[PDB]
């Protein structure tokens, strides 16, 4: 067809409030860097620094526990990077993320 | 006073024992009971997929509604399902085939499914059978063919079966049920449950302790803190009842100290020390020779990890290059020599207390290992001034 | 740095010796000549090359014991003090420095604290 | 005095305990610890949330003396460099 929009909407209602701010933060940096053809994804060092800058997670082991319900729902996955850094990407359509910021205005 | 009487009765109500509470769950329960009244009175039957929150303890909510219908209406029978002992995708239908019509049972004959189970359900002379479903996501297969027959029975001829599936949220209708977003015959219903914030965790504790205890053992300021971080992970009821019950036994153990030998209010500092070994690193308790952190032979190896990251711009190393850095710093400092024959056992030794980790490899030496998180934890709280202070300034 | 910069150092040695109306060179004309060279090479980058070292009151004590471990094993406690008091190390700080490493399992002493042997 | 702001709009347009600060800081704690919880505000990490709209540059001694409280009043706990407890 594309993917049902009810799946991405009913997944954030039953989600913790701290996890919604993390999903809405990675979508902003994805579209701003989408024009770059060499986009390999953000690293883990800069991702851990951005959490405390936007009052999110406090430690590292608690941040990894917040990514358990995202990898099981086919939202994000990790790749074996050669630089020892686990990349973070969202295997969805390019037009799906553009229609997500318009439904969160309320 | 009633000191020993309050502690022996507080652990019974705070223990995770079928929390079948009615308050704090109003709009999430009335919709479930009212959905079944239209099917038993209106002679209707369909499907109902309940996508609960991952780990919140809602198994006791459905048990309250099932027992209330038995005392109201008398004539129907409800068959339970407990497929926890079924490791394979098959052997599920014959497990519930022995419950035909209560007093009327039969016996299996080998290879006889999809014939006699769906035949008695279409009989209009029998009562409205209610089937309960659990852990439906674990019953998948290579083509989920076993799930194509249980979702089409209340949609063909003679719809006399209501589907109730109790399972947490892992995946919606993407690969389990491909009939949705493709077929216009089935019309399922989806109900979710948001995580309970402070508006429900604090409320569920007011009717939990004030109704069975005589006097509280903690102040009201400690309730707003324990109910603050428990809803940030998932919001489980068992996690909220365990973080508070565990913080009482640590204070109760301190009561029998130079008191019984020949109530009080639990402070907030007594609670942070219990969750101190959950998310916080245990690197402070290391004085008076207390072996509660790091011994010795491992700090001289992990200190050389950051010495190679700033020189090669990589955060991954291996057992081969780890001994090369140790064989150089030992000859210039005159320390204990550790051969590489037992250094592999050290790799399977530094994993607790929240530190570095690794994976499993067939061959030795060549093992791709990495580090957890390194930023600012070797100073202030940790000494590292008279022990390995000369190592960081050397290279 | 090659042979081109070798002759440039000797050229700056006469730039300061002729300002004092003298025909000889002193140590002042050498330290001030290399001072402008170190400042010029640091200005070509984006920072300044410095160092960091904490004066530990027990860093040079462990290095003195190393002179006796390579020579023997049964080192006498009274003989090891023949070299510590030469430079000017106070014996009061040595008693508090033994427990800083013995607690972390480095060496071991007896009941009278008169026998020390590197394990 | 008005002869200095002439080139300002020409070049930029062609190219492009703590006085009242501590009393207002307690109001912000109701929306960062009691509402949008994070459990990671204090010490050097406070600079990522102390901006908002009030200026006034804070000194190293002022931000150090503020750590004496909070713990006794159940606000922010102490740890090491970057604190993130309570």
XYZ file of C-alpha atoms in Angstrom:
706
model
C 0.000 0.000 0.000
C 1.782 2.863 3.135
C 2.071 1.767 6.754
C -0.981 2.289 9.005
C -0.781 5.579 10.883
C -2.727 4.078 13.803
C 0.309 1.996 14.803
C 2.577 5.018 15.311
C -0.219 6.865 17.149
C -1.301 4.114 19.559
C 2.320 3.366 20.496
C 3.002 6.773 22.088
C -0.203 6.897 24.154
C 0.806 3.772 26.114
C 4.420 4.996 26.365
C 6.235 6.613 29.270
C 6.451 10.433 29.154
C 10.262 10.443 29.158
C 10.427 8.117 26.140
C 8.222 10.365 23.988
C 10.696 13.240 24.268
C 13.485 10.997 22.988
C 11.509 9.880 19.927
C 10.562 13.482 19.110
C 14.224 14.543 19.415
C 15.729 12.072 16.933
C 13.131 12.920 14.276
C 14.229 16.572 14.273
C 17.898 15.745 13.640
C 16.934 13.201 10.959
C 15.138 15.562 8.564
C 17.710 18.340 9.032
C 20.519 15.963 7.984
C 18.505 14.010 5.393
C 19.874 16.130 2.529
C 23.348 14.712 3.200
C 23.732 11.542 1.079
C 26.414 10.199 3.461
C 24.027 10.052 6.445
C 25.177 7.077 8.540
C 23.234 7.982 11.681
C 24.075 9.730 14.928
C 26.642 8.216 17.280
C 26.121 7.208 20.921
C 28.434 9.747 22.584
C 26.592 12.813 21.278
C 23.249 11.094 21.901
C 24.066 10.575 25.585
C 25.090 14.228 25.945
C 21.859 15.494 24.362
C 19.726 13.671 26.951
C 20.835 15.780 29.923
C 20.762 18.960 27.815
C 16.999 18.450 27.329
C 16.320 17.103 30.863
C 15.801 13.440 29.952
C 17.703 10.411 31.254
C 20.133 10.598 34.180
C 22.441 7.573 33.796
C 23.555 5.174 31.050
C 22.059 1.837 32.127
C 18.646 3.479 32.545
C 18.908 4.932 29.032
C 19.501 1.466 27.570
C 16.409 0.193 29.397
C 14.301 2.898 27.728
C 15.308 1.537 24.301
C 13.847 -1.932 24.938
C 10.274 -1.164 23.852
C 11.561 0.591 20.709
C 13.672 -2.265 19.322
C 10.871 -4.799 19.869
C 8.254 -2.665 18.074
C 10.386 -2.499 14.887
C 11.064 1.214 15.434
C 14.871 1.356 15.781
C 17.680 -1.174 15.461
C 21.420 -1.348 16.094
C 24.174 -2.165 13.605
C 27.661 -3.579 14.094
C 29.685 -0.449 13.404
C 33.375 -0.682 12.605
C 34.150 2.246 14.934
C 32.667 0.450 17.952
C 29.696 2.849 18.067
C 26.130 1.537 17.836
C 24.300 3.627 15.243
C 20.652 4.625 15.666
C 18.339 4.697 12.645
C 14.617 4.347 11.973
C 13.836 1.892 9.123
C 10.710 3.646 7.844
C 9.715 5.630 4.768
C 11.038 9.135 4.161
C 7.496 10.488 3.806
C 6.256 8.931 7.048
C 8.444 10.997 9.390
C 7.397 14.213 7.621
C 3.737 13.615 8.560
C 4.491 12.960 12.249
C 5.244 16.549 13.313
C 1.838 17.774 12.081
C -0.222 15.445 14.302
C 1.616 16.381 17.529
C 0.534 20.044 17.474
C -2.149 19.448 20.129
C 3.182 0.728 71.677
C 2.212 -1.200 68.534
C 5.693 -1.215 67.000
C 6.161 -4.908 66.213
C 2.488 -5.274 65.284
C 2.617 -2.728 62.447
C 5.695 -4.183 60.725
C 4.396 -7.768 60.738
C 1.179 -6.613 59.023
C 2.652 -4.108 56.546
C 4.663 -6.660 54.551
C 1.500 -8.662 53.813
C -0.308 -5.787 52.084
C 2.800 -4.459 50.287
C 3.673 -7.848 48.762
C 2.718 -8.470 45.124
C -0.229 -10.770 45.860
C -3.066 -10.510 43.282
C -3.605 -6.718 43.423
C -7.363 -6.706 42.781
C -8.031 -3.070 43.633
C -11.048 -1.150 42.340
C -10.117 2.553 42.794
C -7.666 4.378 40.500
C -8.949 2.235 37.559
C -12.413 3.476 36.554
C -12.487 4.437 32.861
C -10.107 1.562 32.009
C -12.438 -1.091 33.480
C -16.027 0.022 32.815
C -15.456 -0.172 29.051
C -14.419 -3.833 29.306
C -17.438 -4.980 31.327
C -19.897 -2.981 29.210
C -18.458 -4.464 26.005
C -19.451 -7.984 27.097
C -22.994 -7.042 28.156
C -23.990 -6.228 24.568
C -22.739 -9.620 23.349
C -24.553 -11.733 25.951
C -27.842 -9.810 25.626
C -27.756 -8.796 21.952
C -26.671 -12.273 20.777
C -23.500 -10.832 19.232
C -19.954 -12.172 19.047
C -16.706 -10.763 17.676
C -13.040 -10.221 18.477
C -11.370 -8.005 21.071
C -7.591 -7.522 21.157
C -6.354 -5.984 24.420
C -2.910 -4.411 23.934
C -1.809 -3.775 27.495
C 1.239 -1.825 28.556
C 4.536 -3.763 28.742
C 4.696 -4.972 32.338
C 2.126 -3.150 34.467
C 0.291 -5.936 36.317
C -3.157 -5.924 34.706
C -3.830 -9.666 35.010
C -5.897 -9.071 38.162
C -8.172 -6.579 36.378
C -9.664 -9.195 34.045
C -10.110 -11.702 36.882
C -12.369 -9.241 38.717
C -14.775 -8.930 35.781
C -14.992 -12.687 35.143
C -15.982 -13.498 38.733
C -18.628 -10.751 38.799
C -20.444 -12.246 35.799
C -20.764 -15.640 37.509
C -22.746 -14.216 40.438
C -24.967 -12.122 38.146
C -25.920 -14.628 35.428
C -26.064 -18.396 35.967
C -26.048 -20.741 32.987
C -22.877 -20.075 31.001
C -19.440 -21.658 31.356
C -16.016 -20.040 30.952
C -13.002 -22.140 29.935
C -9.559 -20.953 31.019
C -6.348 -21.064 28.982
C -2.839 -21.602 30.375
C -0.422 -22.406 27.532
C 2.729 -21.808 29.597
C 3.778 -25.480 29.304
C 3.482 -25.491 25.481
C 6.930 -24.761 24.049
C 5.806 -25.603 20.494
C 3.282 -23.821 18.293
C 1.076 -26.928 18.035
C -0.617 -28.985 20.799
C -2.765 -25.962 21.700
C -6.171 -26.845 20.237
C -6.300 -30.407 21.695
C -5.313 -28.952 25.082
C -8.687 -27.167 25.300
C -10.710 -29.757 23.354
C -11.538 -31.786 26.484
C -13.950 -29.056 27.689
C -16.948 -29.480 25.378
C -20.038 -28.821 27.528
C -18.854 -29.312 31.122
C -20.638 -32.575 31.972
C -20.309 -33.868 28.386
C -16.678 -34.693 27.575
C -14.940 -36.937 25.045
C -11.495 -38.355 24.272
C -8.969 -37.572 21.522
C -8.084 -40.014 18.759
C -4.977 -38.453 17.196
C -5.035 -35.891 14.374
C -8.582 -34.547 14.707
C -8.388 -30.742 15.003
C -10.247 -28.108 12.953
C -13.269 -30.439 12.795
C -14.839 -31.098 16.205
C -13.732 -27.911 17.990
C -15.438 -25.491 15.588
C -18.489 -27.756 15.193
C -19.795 -27.426 18.757
C -19.226 -23.655 18.739
C -21.623 -23.117 15.815
C -24.404 -24.957 17.679
C -27.121 -22.449 18.585
C -28.626 -24.777 21.214
C -25.572 -24.425 23.458
C -24.770 -21.527 25.781
C -22.562 -18.576 24.885
C -19.032 -19.918 25.336
C -16.373 -17.392 26.377
C -12.779 -18.226 25.426
C -9.817 -16.417 27.003
C -6.551 -15.885 25.120
C -3.108 -15.156 26.558
C 0.438 -14.652 25.214
C -0.829 -14.823 21.638
C 2.436 -13.349 20.326
C 4.390 -16.387 21.560
C 2.188 -18.749 19.502
C 3.574 -17.502 16.175
C 5.193 -19.708 13.536
C 6.996 -19.300 10.214
C 3.721 -18.296 8.552
C 1.447 -17.885 11.605
C -1.005 -20.392 10.118
C -2.302 -21.392 13.566
C -3.617 -17.840 14.107
C -5.687 -17.787 10.895
C -8.420 -20.087 12.260
C -9.035 -18.579 15.718
C -9.725 -15.071 14.356
C -12.239 -16.128 11.673
C -14.636 -18.226 13.780
C -16.698 -15.275 15.156
C -17.092 -13.982 11.594
C -18.419 -16.869 9.445
C -21.714 -18.768 10.022
C -23.132 -18.905 13.558
C -21.000 -16.373 15.464
C -21.192 -17.572 19.084
C -17.700 -16.941 20.457
C -16.118 -13.851 22.033
C -12.342 -13.431 21.786
C -10.509 -11.901 24.762
C -6.733 -11.672 24.450
C -4.658 -10.563 27.443
C -1.163 -9.615 26.279
C 1.259 -6.716 26.572
C 2.270 -4.441 23.691
C 5.099 -5.751 21.506
C 3.818 -5.517 17.929
C 0.485 -4.453 16.450
C -1.128 -5.739 13.230
C 1.885 -5.966 10.925
C 2.922 -9.623 10.520
C 0.824 -11.518 13.092
C -2.602 -10.817 11.533
C -2.141 -9.873 7.851
C -5.920 -9.871 7.304
C -6.195 -6.307 8.616
C -5.537 -3.436 6.190
C -6.353 -5.888 3.384
C -9.687 -7.600 4.089
C -12.995 -5.825 4.719
C -14.660 -8.749 6.531
C -13.003 -8.681 9.972
C -13.424 -5.558 12.129
C -11.434 -5.997 15.356
C -11.375 -3.614 18.309
C -8.236 -2.227 19.954
C -7.934 -0.805 23.474
C -4.669 0.441 24.981
C -3.620 1.361 28.518
C -1.364 4.385 29.145
C 1.292 4.160 31.875
C 0.071 5.321 35.276
C 1.799 8.548 36.321
C 1.732 10.195 39.765
C -2.048 10.649 39.486
C -2.554 6.887 39.942
C 0.552 5.526 41.698
C 0.114 7.920 44.627
C -3.642 7.282 44.622
C -3.277 3.487 44.652
C -1.156 3.738 47.821
C -3.650 5.803 49.837
C -6.248 3.007 49.778
C -3.525 0.366 50.287
C -1.930 1.291 53.638
C -4.522 3.519 55.344
C -7.168 0.756 55.214
C -5.185 -2.118 56.770
C -2.609 -0.373 59.007
C -3.188 1.629 62.177
C -0.431 4.236 61.749
C 1.876 5.022 58.846
C 5.602 4.298 59.106
C 6.773 6.967 56.638
C 6.149 10.639 55.953
C 4.234 12.100 53.018
C 7.389 13.595 51.481
C 8.852 10.148 50.765
C 5.765 9.077 48.800
C 6.203 11.757 46.117
C 9.776 10.589 45.431
C 9.266 6.814 45.262
C 6.285 7.332 42.932
C 8.331 9.667 40.701
C 10.985 7.340 39.241
C 8.831 4.190 39.190
C 6.645 5.688 36.433
C 9.655 6.786 34.351
C 10.676 3.239 33.351
C 7.308 1.599 32.677
C 4.930 2.148 35.587
C 4.490 -1.365 36.950
C 2.394 -1.888 40.072
C 4.732 -4.625 41.322
C 7.731 -2.303 40.952
C 5.997 0.380 43.031
C 5.041 -2.092 45.775
C 8.559 -3.579 45.842
C 10.550 -0.330 45.968
C 8.606 0.716 49.084
C 8.496 -2.651 50.868
C 12.251 -3.122 50.430
C 12.926 0.310 51.953
C 11.172 -0.776 55.170
C 13.122 -3.947 55.987
C 16.400 -2.012 55.809
C 15.102 0.449 58.412
C 13.400 -2.269 60.479
C 16.700 -4.165 60.695
C 18.269 -1.050 62.242
C 15.592 -0.959 64.963
C 16.969 -4.126 66.581
C 20.332 -2.447 67.279
C 21.136 -1.847 70.969
C 17.401 -1.639 71.691
C 15.986 -5.121 72.290
C 19.161 -6.191 74.123
C 19.579 -5.562 77.843
C 5.838 4.465 65.229
C 8.967 5.975 63.682
C 9.039 7.790 60.341
C 11.272 6.500 57.546
C 13.249 9.339 55.992
C 13.964 9.868 52.319
C 17.690 9.145 52.710
C 16.819 5.569 53.721
C 15.144 5.046 50.322
C 17.861 6.447 48.044
C 20.388 4.019 49.545
C 18.251 1.049 48.464
C 18.153 2.165 44.814
C 21.818 3.141 45.088
C 22.962 -0.299 43.883
C 20.387 -0.404 41.056
C 21.347 2.484 38.765
C 24.200 4.121 40.701
C 27.780 2.914 40.496
C 29.259 1.314 43.618
C 32.659 2.998 43.445
C 32.548 5.076 46.653
C 32.753 2.308 49.287
C 36.457 1.497 49.043
C 38.084 2.630 52.318
C 39.498 0.616 55.263
C 40.417 -2.168 52.842
C 36.766 -2.916 52.087
C 36.514 -5.067 48.950
C 33.227 -3.563 47.770
C 34.395 -2.182 44.408
C 37.579 -2.983 42.475
C 40.398 -5.282 43.689
C 43.705 -4.369 42.031
C 44.840 -6.417 39.018
C 41.901 -5.093 36.953
C 42.449 -1.352 37.464
C 45.965 -1.574 35.988
C 44.418 -3.009 32.797
C 41.332 -0.807 32.374
C 43.399 2.354 32.911
C 45.223 1.679 29.627
C 41.925 1.566 27.707
C 41.567 5.352 27.500
C 45.283 5.603 26.667
C 44.566 3.878 23.333
C 41.310 5.680 22.484
C 42.882 9.151 22.315
C 45.708 7.789 20.124
C 43.765 5.684 17.589
C 40.347 7.441 17.661
C 38.649 4.083 18.322
C 36.782 2.801 21.376
C 37.172 -0.931 20.634
C 40.155 -3.108 21.555
C 40.987 -6.791 22.024
C 42.821 -9.173 24.334
C 45.903 -9.150 22.097
C 46.726 -5.452 22.424
C 45.679 -5.412 26.095
C 48.674 -7.521 27.136
C 51.017 -5.374 25.030
C 50.177 -2.296 27.109
C 50.496 -4.294 30.341
C 53.844 -5.870 29.421
C 55.311 -2.378 28.911
C 54.061 -0.669 32.084
C 55.105 -3.597 34.300
C 58.791 -3.573 33.331
C 59.075 0.183 33.999
C 57.267 0.107 37.369
C 58.252 -3.261 38.954
C 54.819 -4.672 39.750
C 53.250 -8.132 39.841
C 53.657 -9.944 36.525
C 50.443 -11.484 35.168
C 50.829 -13.859 32.230
C 48.283 -13.869 29.405
C 47.333 -17.476 30.233
C 44.877 -16.274 32.901
C 44.022 -12.861 31.420
C 41.077 -14.335 29.495
C 39.361 -15.142 32.800
C 39.562 -11.433 33.648
C 37.389 -10.698 30.606
C 34.618 -12.798 32.153
C 35.165 -11.080 35.501
C 34.557 -7.357 34.848
C 30.852 -7.260 34.016
C 28.968 -6.570 37.270
C 28.537 -3.202 39.034
C 27.651 -1.628 35.672
C 30.934 -1.427 33.757
C 32.338 -2.586 30.420
C 30.948 -5.582 28.552
C 31.756 -7.942 25.704
C 30.353 -10.807 23.631
C 31.205 -14.459 22.949
C 33.909 -15.514 20.488
C 35.171 -18.929 19.418
C 38.871 -18.103 19.116
C 40.854 -16.504 21.929
C 42.947 -13.300 21.837
C 41.115 -11.882 18.795
C 37.978 -10.829 20.680
C 36.187 -7.605 19.734
C 35.526 -5.904 23.076
C 34.329 -2.391 23.898
C 33.779 -0.057 26.848
C 30.513 1.050 28.440
C 30.772 4.754 29.331
C 33.828 6.826 30.286
C 33.603 10.547 31.045
C 34.202 11.808 34.597
C 34.144 9.183 37.357
C 37.828 8.601 38.167
C 38.202 11.784 40.262
C 36.441 13.520 43.164
C 34.340 10.526 44.218
C 37.116 8.085 43.269
C 40.701 8.548 44.451
C 43.055 7.490 41.623
C 45.662 9.912 43.017
C 48.147 7.699 44.892
C 47.319 4.401 43.121
C 47.272 4.900 39.339
C 48.082 8.621 39.389
C 51.516 8.042 37.856
C 50.061 5.881 35.061
C 47.822 8.564 33.539
C 50.732 11.038 33.487
C 53.019 8.506 31.746
C 51.157 7.007 28.783
C 63.188 20.214 12.323
C 66.194 19.482 10.109
C 69.570 21.011 9.238
C 67.916 24.264 8.127
C 66.841 25.132 11.683
C 70.189 24.106 13.202
C 72.054 27.139 11.837
C 69.150 29.435 12.763
C 69.660 28.831 16.493
C 73.301 29.948 16.379
C 72.261 33.051 14.420
C 70.080 34.355 17.269
C 72.940 33.987 19.774
C 74.580 37.198 18.498
C 71.376 39.271 18.375
C 71.384 39.823 22.155
C 75.137 39.768 22.863
C 75.626 42.975 20.843
C 73.013 44.961 22.799
C 75.048 45.116 26.035
C 78.181 46.525 24.321
C 80.037 43.285 25.103
C 81.853 40.684 23.014
C 80.849 37.616 25.066
C 77.641 35.620 25.463
C 75.898 34.623 28.693
C 73.002 32.365 29.661
C 70.509 35.235 29.323
C 71.071 35.471 25.556
C 70.211 31.761 25.192
C 67.032 31.501 27.277
C 65.552 34.626 25.671
C 66.449 33.425 22.164
C 64.470 30.176 22.484
C 61.611 32.007 24.220
C 60.536 33.680 20.973
C 60.814 30.340 19.158
C 58.491 28.516 21.564
C 55.966 31.366 21.402
C 55.992 31.429 17.591
C 55.410 27.685 17.192
C 52.509 27.753 19.664
C 50.831 30.627 17.802
C 50.636 28.523 14.624
C 48.082 26.238 16.321
C 44.820 26.841 18.174
C 45.992 26.304 21.763
C 49.071 26.438 24.003
C 51.131 23.396 24.941
C 51.228 23.078 28.731
C 51.657 20.293 31.288
C 49.905 18.964 34.388
C 51.602 17.310 37.361
C 50.383 16.943 40.949
C 53.085 16.949 43.636
C 52.123 13.704 45.362
C 53.659 13.365 48.851
C 54.284 9.679 48.122
C 55.251 9.482 44.445
C 59.050 9.569 44.835
C 58.957 7.256 47.864
C 57.908 4.221 45.815
C 60.619 4.959 43.237
C 63.307 4.814 45.936
C 62.252 1.312 47.007
C 62.607 0.172 43.382
C 66.385 0.636 43.646
C 66.527 -2.225 46.178
C 64.063 -4.652 44.562
C 66.188 -5.135 41.436
C 69.256 -5.795 43.598
C 67.738 -8.134 46.167
C 64.563 -9.540 47.675
C 65.065 -9.574 51.469
C 65.524 -5.821 51.799
C 66.234 -4.643 55.337
C 63.875 -1.992 56.687
C 66.739 -0.089 58.337
C 68.952 -0.320 55.239
C 66.325 1.152 52.895
C 66.375 4.413 54.890
C 70.045 5.038 54.046
C 69.004 6.646 50.736
C 65.674 8.291 51.614
C 67.221 10.699 54.146
C 69.962 11.740 51.705
C 67.816 14.068 49.586
C 65.677 15.320 52.480
C 62.663 13.061 52.963
C 61.028 13.298 56.380
C 60.714 9.939 58.193
C 57.304 10.892 59.620
C 55.671 10.764 56.177
C 57.221 7.365 55.406
C 55.283 5.654 58.205
C 51.973 6.958 56.834
C 52.928 6.013 53.257
C 53.451 2.295 53.931
C 49.773 1.777 54.789
C 48.734 3.507 51.547
C 50.152 0.619 49.489
C 50.036 -2.286 51.958
C 46.259 -1.818 52.154
C 46.049 -2.111 48.350
C 48.166 -5.317 48.406
C 51.625 -4.343 47.183
C 54.079 -5.560 49.833
C 53.857 -6.999 53.346
C 55.523 -6.389 56.707
C 55.895 -8.341 59.941
C 54.612 -7.552 63.442
C 57.592 -5.321 64.290
C 57.571 -3.689 60.815
C 61.256 -4.537 60.342
C 61.050 -6.915 57.344
C 59.894 -5.814 53.883
C 59.916 -8.051 50.804
C 58.457 -7.344 47.368
C 55.835 -9.980 46.564
C 25.458 58.830 21.434
C 23.170 58.163 18.454
C 26.172 58.220 16.084
C 27.126 54.639 17.040
C 23.888 52.791 16.199
C 23.972 53.956 12.563
C 26.362 51.247 11.342
C 24.818 48.606 13.629
C 21.625 48.318 11.569
C 23.667 48.626 8.351
C 26.171 45.766 8.703
C 23.945 43.294 10.564
C 20.943 43.707 8.255
C 23.026 43.479 5.069
C 24.622 40.198 6.216
C 22.184 38.508 8.613
C 21.134 32.989 48.705
C 20.897 33.952 45.018
C 18.767 37.105 45.559
C 15.522 36.813 43.534
C 17.019 34.123 41.277
C 16.755 31.489 44.016
C 13.121 32.321 44.815
C 12.178 31.940 41.144
C 14.218 28.725 40.907
C 11.896 26.930 43.339
C 8.968 27.571 40.984
C 10.861 25.928 38.115
C 11.417 22.810 40.246
C 7.661 22.131 40.197
C 7.837 21.701 36.401
C 11.150 19.790 36.181
C 11.070 17.457 39.214
C 7.349 17.477 40.058
C 6.052 17.455 36.450
C 8.523 16.795 33.591
C 10.751 14.544 35.680
C 14.368 13.994 34.657
C 16.259 13.400 37.929
C 19.366 15.104 36.533
C 19.642 18.813 37.404
C 22.481 20.358 39.390
C 26.187 21.252 39.469
C 27.547 21.779 35.920
C 24.402 20.155 34.494
C 22.362 23.096 35.826
C 23.735 25.343 33.057
C 21.590 23.497 30.486
C 18.398 24.618 32.264
C 19.241 27.825 34.186
C 19.114 30.013 31.050
C 15.418 30.263 30.109
C 14.978 34.046 30.229
C 16.871 35.419 33.267
C 20.433 36.557 32.572
C 22.952 37.350 35.356
C 26.090 35.190 34.942
C 26.602 32.827 37.868
C 30.019 32.455 39.481
C 31.780 29.256 40.518
C 31.504 30.119 44.222
C 27.770 30.893 44.083
C 26.882 27.606 42.372
C 29.019 25.724 44.914
C 27.431 27.219 48.041
C 23.951 26.300 46.759
C 24.789 22.583 47.068
C 24.710 22.813 50.878
C 20.897 22.856 50.844
C 18.580 20.830 48.569
C 19.702 17.549 50.161
C 18.288 18.550 53.552
C 15.106 19.858 51.878
C 14.735 16.865 49.497
C 15.586 18.505 46.183
C 18.976 17.688 44.627
C 21.502 15.214 46.039
C 25.285 15.437 45.769
C 27.674 13.033 44.059
C 30.729 13.911 41.957
C 31.338 16.090 38.902
C 28.065 15.748 36.998
C 25.410 14.916 39.603
C 22.174 13.161 38.662
C 20.713 11.852 41.934
C 17.417 13.043 43.438
